[PDB]
Design a protein around this ligand. Structure first.
Ligand SMILES: CC[C@H](C)[C-](O)c1sc(CCOP(=O)(O)OP(=O)(O)O)c(C)[n+]1Cc1cnc(C)nc1N
Ligand SMILES: CC[C@H](C)[C-](O)c1sc(CCOP(=O)(O)OP(=O)(O)O)c(C)[n+]1Cc1cnc(C)nc1N
Ligand SMILES: [Cl-]
Ligand SMILES: [Cl-]
Ligand SMILES: [Cl-]
Ligand SMILES: [Cl-]
Ligand SMILES: [K+]
Ligand SMILES: [K+]
Ligand SMILES: [K+]
Ligand SMILES: [K+]
Ligand SMILES: [Mn+2]
Ligand SMILES: [Mn+2]
Lengths: 390, 336, 336, 390
């Protein structure tokens, strides 16, 4: 018997390399087919009508908001935007499986999670416009949302940095005896970052109640997954770190829900990490700065998460064309009301450029604030002052 | 815009700054069969079009995408250069250079010294978009050059225009030291002028006096050179003050002699940069000038820089050291 | 040794610098049940004995080893602090802080600002051994503080002795901003003096005038404070020159007022640090002092720093800005 | 059939997490038992006598050098040292399987590879002493060896940084049509670094002819592997990146040789990475700065690579006690000759502190060199000048 401290294993007396299984990778868990039919009755979560209607309304309200704000960006009314097209199921399926106070760290393409947690349209808008209602004080580019009330840690642009952070928050939760789980969303491109290897390993070694949720949508900007990795996607990495792992059909809200619900239950009971890789497809451009036709649908028309959910509602007798029409109208009205309000609000006082750099304001930073104030007293005609509060 | 761009070596064509970078890269691969270009999204031509057409011209083994991992991109580039092959790495925004900070500072910069010149990574260049862009906020606006200026063994180079960019980029690529070449992204489309089709070089560690003057020296780099050029115009018109306008070009090793020679003549110095004041590279220039030109200095040296905060989204117009902030500082320094 | 160490709040015991750090950590965990300490090899007491006995006293969930991954250690520490719990991360040598540079600069420093204070990592402290050690060569000798000084949103703090170290470390731990606390490792065993057993604080962003003088101001931090103290003695004896000796203590935000007040009195300034000259923090102090004290300065400000090279093994005695290099620079500045 | 770009896989209609196999990990390949007996004749490489004698002499010469230099350090004659005890088999077994011009990147505990490539005792000594014979010009701490002639890239202290570098050198070799392979050694602690995830993924995606060679010796300084990772060691990570992987008994020079020889053949033919995790045990202290009794042999007396090789030699009739005695004497003499020479050589000229920072010397760096020269003219009595050349 081998005695080495670094592994538990038998000897073998023949030379055999371990080959990766990439052609027959980890299978894709799926609950309902593309016609919204349940495939295996024993896997049906039988979510109640009101909850399934909330999943559906959340994804379509997000879709309505995406369309309007994408247009606002094209017109130059906001500086930037990123849509969620094709990935709305991963957001709502997973958020619905969490407890309200489970802490969320994300990347930027998870706004459905906030929607599901009832983040006001006014606040999505306020952040994108950087107006006086934005609790982020207009400091970050659009879609960098955050909400302390709804336990959604502020998004930042640097990819994957939230992965080891989410692990630390999960370790703290364990110590606090929280009965709380942290979920950490990231894309398959972000998973190539060193911080992903940091986070996965720490969560296993330090026994943290965290779910790592990878949206694998086939592209990182222009880069197809064939140039991103060569193993069997992200799910096949998890067992190597000792992380229980699963791959799901990210266009199936029920598959995403079931996987997330069971991961949450086990992560919190057992203080161990789980990894879920949700297979989907990025229907939109990467962002308003991307024209994706430069490097690449079947997905939009033959396998969309919203369409699939709609078919399911119909089969239960839970939705019809009349309701669909009324909701289309009501959601447009709600988004348009928030949009008009957000455009009319002023931007925050330029003083706010200096606060929160440190908790307190260092005297030398206050000197800089004072220098700006004197500058604007003299040269203010040359600045967009009428747009800014106070 | 907070600035206005204003515009021997054979035939030229009008090129904007992204095109001048492509021209430099195209000339480099044509003449150096070892040269490769790699990084995130460079295969389809890059997110700022700097590599358009190059993979089709030179082949997929020579212009290719990497995984999304900056510490990998730089470590990988160093290893190519260790074999003697030219490695032109891209980092997609300078704001995301930091994951590679250890590979740059502990490895690339020290490779030659610590081996006694048995090994080196001289044939590495790292190019990255840089500087403000109107709405880039915290992570698509940064100017990290002062972080790198404190690291002996690398060169850091920033052009102000398409003509400058191609000449300085070719020099970086061919220089026998690891170089970081920061491309001011606001100029990628905005600045266009005549650029030689065929390769040419502009020397590193050499400032350029773009306008002679006698009353005050103004120093900047990147887009900020255009701001101080306008400031020079404002000062002439409003104050009858003659400004000498200098583009530093190379951050390290920097052209100490050209700056000191100017200040010895004018007696006054103002340095400006988008990066935050504290720890910014203007501190190094101001200290050095004070040390060399003490007897000539008629007024304290002025530094007009970004404030000591992260780079904001909606407050950008109030954050940058624009022409009015530079002008006002100059006015006070002239009155001193 | 290139330096000599020379040595209210209740009972004291003689402690060397590593013991003062343990005392600070022990007092911190005793009074703050959320506080944890983690990093490479901290469980058995650390490679410089700074955590001896703490895991046995406070428990394996509170003092524990991480995997060997600095970007992970810092990202992990930020996430603990996001929940409000005190996170005291160790980075084993300051030379290996660079893998975490992106987590420090792009994340920790910007966390509060970019969220509008919805989230923060104020309860994070990162402590790391720092500075030369006689034979540490390129990667166990570095002084990285100037890299961090250009990043608004973090504090950077360096003590000169055991009494100073415990008071400043407690202040870092309790401060509501991410702090980097650099422990001069050559002093871990070498410097010993009386240290209060019970907790006490020394304020951040406050310099200490340790010796009053009238002819010249000398500024340093860490071990280098002891070098300039000796230099002050050499100047008194050899030149009849009265030196005011100041320990800066906090690198950012730094105590501009105390330094300027001194130079307004003396008319002359010399700043010294082990880190390389170019881009070093002496540049920021020299620039600022020149700007505020122009009319009082009788001579150019002198900077006596490490050379602009990586930190050598066998040449260490020739590399460091020792008492003779500082003395000689002072002599010339006095003659100016 | 699933259509997702990010993975190739079937659907599954039941929720099943993938569990890691940690208790029955990847088996440990072994060729000879602890008595130097071949276990499976079909795996015997039948290396010729002269080559096996070179493996043995290389490991014992390294061992003799380690003992002397460890003592030199304890006495303060050199500033630092790190021994190779217990790991000598991994170095020589692998080096013997490489072509002479295959490029090596290492960590610091692979000096046997240089020994096997005939690096002179005088040059190991020169580096540790930082004397005038050191081609590294005395700039790095001891054991940071490098040799351009023997294709052994200079060691640096920052852990794992050489991993993505080695990948780049392998990509360059492929382009050059080299028929060359790069090998990259690192420890199991170093494998936790982000750069390891960078290197492994790049080598797979970019199809590079590289062997990643992990010495898993149970500890990273004080930290046992139970605190380093929770999956099945380092070998189990490789398939996740699409890397062919194997675990070997690192105390068996033949197992290490066979695995390395086949990896090299396939990596160079196929332009694909291989990973070998060699299970061993760090018999020595981590370094001269470590007293390992603070945190932790059977290994030294019951499973040592040198002992095992010696048993094999005896079984072939290739060694005996008389030869062992003569070689013990000759190797001590050779090491002691180099040691005496190294101690008598001066250190290099202090001018050399300034060269090679850049290829050329920048004028401002020359000004600094000049400032030192003037300084030593005046204050030279206060410096150890008599020890330094010129
Ligand atoms: C809002 C603007 C965004 C955040 C931007 O800057 C991004 S997004 C991105 C592609 C990420 O791909 P992904 O993880 O697959 O996620 P999706 O966009 O959902 O497919 C890159 C390379 N970038 C650039 C980038 C590169 N490197 C780092 C460390 N961080 C980045 N943000
Ligand atoms: C010669 C002095 C050496 C190089 C030193 O500084 C080291 S060695 C080391 C343990 C590495 O353990 P390992 O990879 O298992 O290798 P072995 O020592 O062979 O067991 C650390 C944490 N360190 C400290 C360290 C921490 N972090 C980084 C990025 N690099 C380091 N060198
Ligand atoms: Cl105007
Ligand atoms: Cl942009
Ligand atoms: Cl040390
Ligand atoms: Cl002396
Ligand atoms: K992030
Ligand atoms: K170069
Ligand atoms: K703190
Ligand atoms: K290394
Ligand atoms: Mn993606
Ligand atoms: Mn180890």
């Amino acid at each position: 018997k081998p005695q080495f401290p670094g592994a538990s294993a038998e000897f073998i007396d023949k030379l055999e390399f371990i080959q990766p299984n990439v052609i027959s990778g980890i299978p894709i868990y799926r609950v309902m087919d593309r016609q919204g039919q349940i495939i295996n009755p024993s896997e049906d979560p039988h979510l109640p009508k009101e909850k399934v209607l909330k999943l559906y309304k959340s994804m379509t309200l997000l879709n309505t908001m995406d369309r309007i704000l994408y247009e606002s960006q094209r017109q130059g009314r906001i500086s930037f935007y990123m849509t969620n097209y094709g990935e709305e199921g991963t957001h709502v399926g997973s958020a619905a499986a969490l407890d309200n106070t489970d802490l969320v760290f994300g990347q930027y393409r998870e706004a459905g999670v906030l929607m599901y947690r009832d983040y006001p349209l006014e606040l999505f808008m306020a952040q994108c416009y950087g107006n006086i209602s934005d609790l982020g004080k207009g400091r970050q580019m659009p879609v960098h949302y955050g909400c302390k009330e709804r336990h959604f840690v502020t998004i930042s642009s640097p990819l994957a940095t939230q992965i080891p952070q989410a692990v630390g928050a999960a370790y703290a939760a364990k110590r606090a005896n929280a009965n709380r789980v942290v979920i950490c969303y990231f894309g398959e491109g972000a998973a190539s970052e060193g911080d992903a290897h940091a986070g996965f390993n720490f969560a296993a070694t330090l026994e943290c109640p965290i779910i790592f949720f990878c949206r694998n949508n086939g592209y990182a900007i222009s880069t197809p997954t064939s140039e991103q990795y060569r193993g069997d996607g992200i799910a096949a990495r998890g067992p190597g770190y000792g992380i229980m792992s699963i791959r799901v059909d990210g266009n199936d809200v029920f598959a995403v829900y079931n996987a997330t619900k069971e991961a949450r239950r086990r992560a919190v009971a057992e203080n161990q990490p789980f990894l879920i890789e949700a297979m989907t497809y990025r229907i939109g451009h990467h962002s308003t700065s991307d024209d994706s036709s430069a490097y690449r649908n079947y997905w939009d028309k033959q396998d969309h998460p919203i369409s699939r959910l709609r078919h399911y509602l119909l089969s239960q007798g839970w939705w019809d064309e009349e309701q669909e029409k009324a909701w289309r109208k009501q959601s447009r009205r709600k988004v348009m009301e928030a949009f008009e309000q957000a455009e009319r609000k002023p931007k925050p006082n330029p003083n706010l450029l200096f606060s929160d750099v440190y908790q307190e304001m260092p005297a030398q930073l206050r000197k800089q604030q004072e220098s700006l104030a004197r500058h604007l007293q003299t040269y203010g005609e040359h600045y967009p002052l009428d747009h800014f509060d106070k | 815009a907070h600035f206005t761009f204003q515009p021997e070596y054979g035939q030229t064509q009008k090129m904007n700054l992204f095109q001048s970078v492509t021209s430099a890269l195209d000339n480099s691969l044509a003449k150096d069969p070892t040269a490769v270009i790699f990084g995130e999204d460079v295969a389809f031509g890059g997110v700022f079009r700097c590599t358009v057409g190059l993979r089709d011209k030179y082949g997929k083994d020579r212009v290719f995408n990497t995984p999304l991992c900056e510490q990998g991109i730089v470590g990988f580039g160093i290893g190519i250069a260790v074999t003697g092959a030219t490695a032109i790495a891209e980092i997609q925004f300078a704001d995301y250079i930091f994951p590679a900070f250890d590979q740059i500072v502990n490895e690339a910069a020290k490779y030659r010294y610590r081996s006694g010149d048995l090994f080196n990574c001289g044939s590495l260049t790292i190019r990255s978009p840089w500087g403000c862009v109107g709405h880039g906020a915290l992570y698509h606006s940064q100017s990290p050059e002062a972080f790198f200026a404190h690291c002996p063994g690398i060169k850091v180079v920033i052009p102000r225009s398409p003509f400058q960019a191609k000449g300085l980029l070719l020099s970086c690529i061919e220089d026998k030291n690891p170089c970081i070449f920061f491309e001011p992204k606001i100029l990628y489309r905005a600045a266009a002028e005549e650029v030689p089709i065929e390769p040419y070089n502009i020397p590193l560690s050499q400032a350029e006096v773009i306008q002679e003057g006698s009353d005050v020296t103004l120093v900047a780099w990147g887009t900020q050179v255009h701001v101080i050029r306008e400031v020079a115009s404002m000062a002439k018109e409003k104050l009858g003050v003659s400004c000498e306008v200098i583009d530093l070009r190379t951050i390290i090793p920097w052209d100490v002699d050209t700056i000191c020679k100017s200040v010895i003549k004018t007696g006054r110095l103002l340095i400006s940069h988008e990066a935050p004041l504290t720890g910014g590279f203007a501190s190094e220039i101001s200290s050095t000038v004070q040390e060399e030109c003490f007897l000539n200095l008629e007024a304290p040296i002025s530094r007009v820089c970004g404030y000591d905060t992260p780079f904001p989204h909606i407050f950008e117009p109030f954050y940058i050291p624009d022409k009015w902030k530079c002008y006002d500082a100059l006015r006070k320094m002239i009155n001193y």
